Ligand binder design. Structure first.
Ligand SMILES: *[C@@](O)(CO)[C@H](C[C@@H]1CCNC1=O)NC(=O)[C@H](CC(C)C)NC(=O)c1cc2c(OC)cccc2[nH]1
Ligand SMILES: *[C@@](O)(CO)[C@H](C[C@@H]1CCNC1=O)NC(=O)[C@H](CC(C)C)NC(=O)c1cc2c(OC)cccc2[nH]1
Lengths: 303, 304
């Protein structure tokens, strides 16, 4: 028993982190087989970054313009291309530690692990969720561009995030490994706002189930609600609507606890309307929405 | 961004193995040519109720122990018991052994746990050792022998190996020399921990982290002595500070220019008067599982 924000083990990704430098600009890259993936703004000077014409800047670069270091070894760049906001550097050497991998595009509300890494050296690992407004609430500092987010299924690493930006509000933005931003953001040195965020309702409900599984029931009540009537109140509070698919994904948690989903929904509605008084749930004073149903089932199955 | 962060787990993943005796299986830690694991692996379920470990071990030979890295067996060639830990000498030195140390941590100290089932790592998360010598972890059946660690430079400091889940759902275990943290024993019995307290040095670290981020409404105009602060803190079920606690706050004190005892006086007012409906770092709750090193780490990007 117990419930904790948990990341996937990071070793398979650690073996792929390298450092990429062009001019006086340095960030992290991801070394898979004989290709190194990194944010394309590594080719910019401070002056270029305000309004970079990336295709124009890239064609003026030569392979020798790129310094790639994998620990204490320099990797020789023998080719370069760019796919949207991701620069791809061909090197003459295959990474022997390349895991089985895929590139995927994650959906809002799904979680992933981030390997924090600076100058190509891994520093920490933590779990994030893709927000409905396509931002991430992460812990990226200077030099964190090129950090990647991932999930691991069996032995396959599914890369879903590359880090590019910190917004003025302190949340973060980035791309998939195809170089497409999540959300309406652009890799230029400007202050950018996100759309209004919303709360990931299916994840709050999963987390309430985890709290019940771990002996926390104070927020339950004897009431039920219809799905529509729940969604009416949820939307009033800037919660995402709960779909029937979401209801279905929560089935196993409902079965384990014997609490119907719409019964939990009635609990959540009362919590939104009354607050938590001074009380906590799983040690939190706020309703947590960055655990998916799968995240909860993985830590609570059997308990 | 300020959030809980585990260390990268790869150096430890390469050291996880499975240890089985009969049908009893758990996890072990493979460093050089020795595997470390909880000694109750030698017990049947019924043996675990009231074990005499010295007697149970005399009956065991090297050939009764199955150690597997993945599906690959590592032949056991020696065995000995050290407190609550079994040490199995194996015929292969782990080529992935990192630079490592065995350390015994203080309450309040944090560490990463590599969750691991059947010798296969499944996740990593950050834990704090509570003042009552429990940890609020996430441990299912088959998690015994999971380890807790910190990584400084390229050296892994192992501090915890998992044994037990208490009735209340918190967790208990040993250091890597087999000595339990707290007054627990490795027997199949319901055991209770002392009443827990709040980790004062970590609350202070978090207040420094708030100040570093420009959130400083709670800075008051008073100071205090260490002794007067400790006596008042205990009335709020906060841990007394030690001299080591004062010392490890030093860098955060210097970074902000706020003397440690002035921060103590500020915390004391927060305890006596509450938050008055205000938050710190976006929380009405005073957080106590970030150490001074965690705050310096996750504000400066220390890598390993
Ligand atoms: C990368 O490490 C740079 O290579 C860096 C990551 C952030 C720095 C601090 N925390 C981070 O997550 N990213 C940037 O510096 C990006 C670079 C762009 C994509 C070329 N820019 C920003 O993060 C950025 C610029 C501005 C800004 O300007 C003007 C105004 C306000 C916010 C802001 N963020
Ligand atoms: C190990 O995996 C066993 O090798 C296991 C880990 C726990 C099971 C579920 N979550 C865990 O953290 N540990 C145990 O089963 C230990 C075995 C001892 C050390 C021999 N025992 C307990 O965790 C334990 C026993 C009892 C108990 O008895 C009766 C009554 C109440 C609680 C309790 N916990």
């Amino acid at each position: 028993s117990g419930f904790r924000k948990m990341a996937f083990p990071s070793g398979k990704v650690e073996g792929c982190m390298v450092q990429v430098t062009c001019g006086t600009t340095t960030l992290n890259g991801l070394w898979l087989d004989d290709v190194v993936y990194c944010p394309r703004h590594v080719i910019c000077t401070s002056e270029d970054m305000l309004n970079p014409n990336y295709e124009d800047l890239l064609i003026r670069k030569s392979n020798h313009n790129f310094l790639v270091q994998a620990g204490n070894v320099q990797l020789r760049v023998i080719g370069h291309s760019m796919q949207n906001c991701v620069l791809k550097l061909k090197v003459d050497t295959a990474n022997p530690k390349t895991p089985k991998y895929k590139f995927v595009r994650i959906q809002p509300g799904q979680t992933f692990s981030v390997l924090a890494c600076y100058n190509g050296s891994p520093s920490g690992v933590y779990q994030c969720a893709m927000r409905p407004n396509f931002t991430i609430k992460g812990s990226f500092l200077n030099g964190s561009c090129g950090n990647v987010g991932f999930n691991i299924d069996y032995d396959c690493v599914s890369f879903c995030y590359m880090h590019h930006m910190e917004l003025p509000t302190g949340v973060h933005a980035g791309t998939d490994l195809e170089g497409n931003f999540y959300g309406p953001f652009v890799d230029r040195q400007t202050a950018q706002a996100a759309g209004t965020d919303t709360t990931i309702t299916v994840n709050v409900l999963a987390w309430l189930y985890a709290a019940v599984i771990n002996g926390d029931r104070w927020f339950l009540n004897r009431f039920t609600t219809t799905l529509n009537d729940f969604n009416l109140v949820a939307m009033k509070y800037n919660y995402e609507p709960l779909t029937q698919d979401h209801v279905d994904i929560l089935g196993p948690l409902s079965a384990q606890t014997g609490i119907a989903v719409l019964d939990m929904c009635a609990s959540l509605k009362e919590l939104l309307q009354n607050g938590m008084n001074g009380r906590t749930i799983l040690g939190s004073a706020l309703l947590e929405d960055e655990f998916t149903p799968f995240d909860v089932v993985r830590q609570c199955s059997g308990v």
